[PDB]
Amino acid sequence: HHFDHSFSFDCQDKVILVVEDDYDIGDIIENYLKREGMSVIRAMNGKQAIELHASQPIDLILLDIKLPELNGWEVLNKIRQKAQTPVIMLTALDQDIDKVMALRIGADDFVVAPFNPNEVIARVQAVLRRTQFA
Amino acid sequence: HHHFDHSFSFDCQDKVILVVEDDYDIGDIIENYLKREGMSVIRAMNGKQAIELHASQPIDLILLDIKLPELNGWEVLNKIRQKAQTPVIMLTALDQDIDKVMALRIGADDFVVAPFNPNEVIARVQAVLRRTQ
Ligand SMILES: [Mg+2]
Ligand SMILES: [Mg+2]
Ligand SMILES: [Mg+2]
């Protein structure tokens, strides 16, 4: 190739808050993120997610749209009062896509389950790149 | 309590989507869903058609297949970007396609992974159109 169109984005030490009540999906995501050198903080419900976000620098949040007692946009609304941290919504239902697209306080992206975990990594990298200097 | 704003879909109406897809049936279906939501569609079946139609028609967004009969989708993307920075969403199907999306120095505006969820395709097109003025 005579031209340089490709590269490897450096994610080392980026801190990802993974908010997911499903243990196995959360574990899969965590394992894939760590393979890229990212640091992972786990939250299994929204009140925990809000407290962990408030007490620590976070580069990106992967946020379940449906938690046991809060909807994802309720968590995002509270997080946004503390910081402009990028958020990718984890969805599953086509109705979830409608909700995300219509948010007044929007997410940076979404991903639709079931997913190849490599898709999640790609979307995390894309949002981290767009918000590198935000 | 009101968390939503449903006007965002109306902003996509009449925007022009260049759908570059080598499978006639897949492109027919994608076109139908995009038109159902009020967008307009121009169809290209290979890279040469994509380059000609992009050069001559006002295009708001390109939906770009990776596997194409001559130039592949990555090579078409490079030829398109030599002339203009038109937003692009890649239609991917293999893990290796996801790797290549991640490696792009000038990122694709989005991508979607087969099998294609048609409501996800609609939503990602709308989201990129909104982000790119
Ligand atoms: Mg869950
Ligand atoms: Mg999928
Ligand atoms: Mg195809």
> What chain A residue is nearest to B125 in terms of C-alpha separation?
A101
Beta-carbon separation of B4 and A102 below 8 A: yes
Interface A-B: count of C-beta contacts within 8 A: 69
CATH of B8-132, picked from 3.30.70.600, 3.10.180.10, 3.30.530.20, 3.40.50.2300, is 3.40.50.2300
Name the experimental technique: X-ray
Residues of B in contact with A6 (CB under 8 A): 100, 103-105
The C-alpha atoms of residue A39 and residue B71 are separated, in whole angstroms, by: 39
DSSP structural state of residue A7: -
Residues of A in contact with B106 (CB under 8 A): 5
Q: Looking at the complex, does the CB of residue A118 fall below 8 Å from at least one CB of chain B? A: yes
Inter-residue contact B16 to B58 (CB < 8 Å): yes
Task: Give the start-end residues of each E strand in chain A.
Answer: 15-19, 39-43, 60-64, 87-91, 109-112
Domain-wise residue ranges, chain B: 8-132
Q: How far is the CA of A133 from the centre of ligand 2 (A)?
A: 30
The C-alpha atoms of residue B90 and residue B67 are separated, in whole angstroms, by: 11
Close Cβ partners of A55 (under 8 Å, ≥ 6 residues apart):
none
Inter-residue contact B63 to B86 (CB < 8 Å): no
Partner-chain residue, chosen from B105, B123, B126, that has the shortest CB–CB distance to A7: B105
The C-alpha atoms of residue A21 and residue A119 are separated, in whole angstroms, by: 20
The C-alpha atoms of residue A17 and residue A52 are separated, in whole angstroms, by: 8
Is A15-131 a domain of CATH 3.40.50.2300? yes
The angstrom resolution of this structure is 1.6
Inter-residue contact A86 to A59 (CB < 8 Å): yes
Tokens 């909807």 — which residue? A71
Strands B40-44 and B16-20: parallel
User: Token pair of B88, please?
Assistant: 């692009």
Half-sphere exposure of A36 (CA within 13 A, CB side): 24
> What chain B residue is nearest to A94 in terms of C-alpha separation?
B119
**Residue positions counted in chain B:** 133
Degrees, nearest 5: CA angle A22-A28-A29: 90
Inter-residue contact A68 to A21 (CB < 8 Å): yes
Beta-carbon separation of A116 and B111 below 8 A: no
Q: In whole angstroms, how far apart are CA A27 and each of A33, A77, A126, B57, B124?
A: 10, 25, 21, 47, 27
